[PDB]
Symmetry: C3
Subunit: 142 residues, 3 copies
């Protein structure tokens, strides 16, 4: 069968609407089958000295479904190789957000600056269900 047919085991898989605010970047994609995240691109060149942080545009906006959350995670390779991290990791993308996804990168290396180029894959976006809990206040209840 061709790929337009949804296989039985994927009947209930979730769709995510996405706008490329920067049409010159590829759509985010999973690096390998079954990978949890789609990789987000940087729309911009950024140089981070040790300890500096920047709010980096990804060129995309998404519509996370109600009842779900988008989560922006660092990539392990950049984290290990150069100390690149995300200040607010895991970044929380709410269902109602329609703005551009931005990544708060930070250089956690003590001495070597990190150069990010436009078109580099700088984070990964996961989508999960979340419990939109109803709080029940009690006076008292490992």
């Amino acid at each position: 069968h061709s790929s337009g047919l949804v296989p039985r085991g994927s009947h209930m898989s979730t769709t995510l609407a996405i706008v490329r605010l920067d049409p010159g970047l590829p759509l985010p994609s999973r690096a390998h089958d079954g990978d949890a995240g789609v990789d987000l691109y940087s729309a911009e060149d950024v140089e981070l000295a040790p300890g500096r942080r920047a709010l980096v545009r990804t060129g995309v906006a998404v519509a996370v479904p109600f009842g779900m959350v988008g989560l922006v995670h660092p990539r392990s390779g950049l984290a290990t190789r150069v100390g690149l991290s995300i200040v607010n990791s895991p970044g929380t993308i709410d269902a109602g957000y329609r703005g551009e996804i931005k990544v708060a990168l930070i250089n956690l290396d003590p001495a070597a600056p990190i150069v990010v180029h436009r078109g580099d894959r700088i984070a990964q976006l996961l989508v999960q269900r979340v419990e939109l809990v109803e709080l029940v206040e009690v006076s008292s209840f490992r």
Copy 2:
């Protein structure tokens, strides 16, 4: 209809029992409809010099349901604006925990101290299902 009626689409939404150990703080709340997290308050004033961390009381205890986990995430605005982060992010609140939720804040700015005041919203709490996995050890099995 009035708000006491659970709408059909919310019939299965999860309740979370909460004790305000500090009754002078508001209950945690979602900033907007559909937001993944409820914002946690600081019960205390804390000043963090660059690179310092503190274990900050939130004034609340919760009963995360069995089969779920509470997750303490940083807020993006403070992370970007002043470099505020959480050392153990995402903080993992277990179903059996009945103590006060505490937030391990850290100042990741190189030079500017962060002042947290009692009543500031310093983190956000998400609740998700988790797989309480049964390990199956094998000798061998992208």
Copy 3:
């Protein structure tokens, strides 16, 4: 009843195949009933000066089920007491990965080195479902 019987409330609980690449370490375990994570051991001695990071072997490989993700989270006690963190937290373990789980530890204390010994519990592994989303590109759509 003896423990070999799956209780009714655990009928659908997920199994996780695991190989101890280092058979001298215990299998990861939950510290308490209902805890979200199983604690990962270090296979190695590592000393981290302030601001240094290391890619630490855990001695295990896992087979996260398709449709799920493994998540490597810091432990709160080490984070608060000595400033130990994980550069790429939450570390993302994909369903297709069959290599050794490695932990990117970092010392976020300003002045005191952290010593990790072989056999110390240095992180915790959670397993959750993830939405393997199908992107739907649109021109336009808190």
